[PDB]
Write a protein that binds this ligand. Sequence first.
Ligand SMILES: Nc1ncnc2c1ncn2Cc1cc(-c2ccc(F)c(F)c2)ncc1N1CCC[C@](N)(c2ccccn2)C1
Ligand SMILES: [Zn+2]
Ligand SMILES: [Zn+2]
Ligand SMILES: [Zn+2]
Length: 220
Amino acid sequence: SERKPPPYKHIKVNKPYGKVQIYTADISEIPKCNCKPTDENPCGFDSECLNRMLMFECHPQVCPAGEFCQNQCFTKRQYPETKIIKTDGKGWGLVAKRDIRKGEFVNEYVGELIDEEECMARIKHAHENDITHFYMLTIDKDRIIDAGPKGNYSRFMNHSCQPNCETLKWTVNGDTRVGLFAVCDIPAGTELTFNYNLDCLGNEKTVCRCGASNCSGFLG
Ligand SMILES: Nc1ncnc2c1ncn2Cc1cc(-c2ccc(F)c(F)c2)ncc1N1CCC[C@](N)(c2ccccn2)C1
Ligand SMILES: [Zn+2]
Ligand SMILES: [Zn+2]
Ligand SMILES: [Zn+2]
């Protein structure tokens, strides 16, 4: 029983490393929806927002709804309150403090941004030194988020063969960002989990301890 998780820097945004590619957009390049600020829930989850439908985040200076824009989840870091918990064979995990509804933004998978060469080198080093460092999540080819050295609470989310959350790739301020969203209603106090199918089957000493009835037995 370790009382505290391994060291890492709690950040609020992805941090690039080495020769990885980063993209940005000036306020002028960000898409503009046709929501009004007088709408029931402008750019909201139940709204007909053009930007929301296409998984584009509105910018504060660009949106016609102004400050009443409800499509700024990633930038404002609008996460349901969560708590890190300790399980048996799964170790540290994440549960939420309030009920979460289906489709709702849960968190952003944040970390050190690395290219594929760098990721492969880290995994090879981990496998040789027997380190359980699988905080790597692919954005696209040659861009991988490594939440091992630095990340936010999303790194505490465990893998589940029957997950209650899923990753969705959104465009925010000119670049791709990985959001965690609920696939069903989640009662407060339930462990937040997602399906980790973004890497290789490097399951040497690791085994699927999700507990789901459809468990295939591995993580890759
Ligand atoms: N479904 C799981 N079955 C067994 N172990 C799991 C499962 N899902 C996540 N973990 C743990 C784990 C495995 C992999 C992993 C391994 C192989 C893979 F193929 C893969 F996709 C992921 N990367 C990270 C973790 N964590 C994340 C949460 C905190 C953690 N539990 C922890 C850390 C320190 C102390 C206690 N606990 C370690
Ligand atoms: Zn809108
Ligand atoms: Zn908006
Ligand atoms: Zn399983």
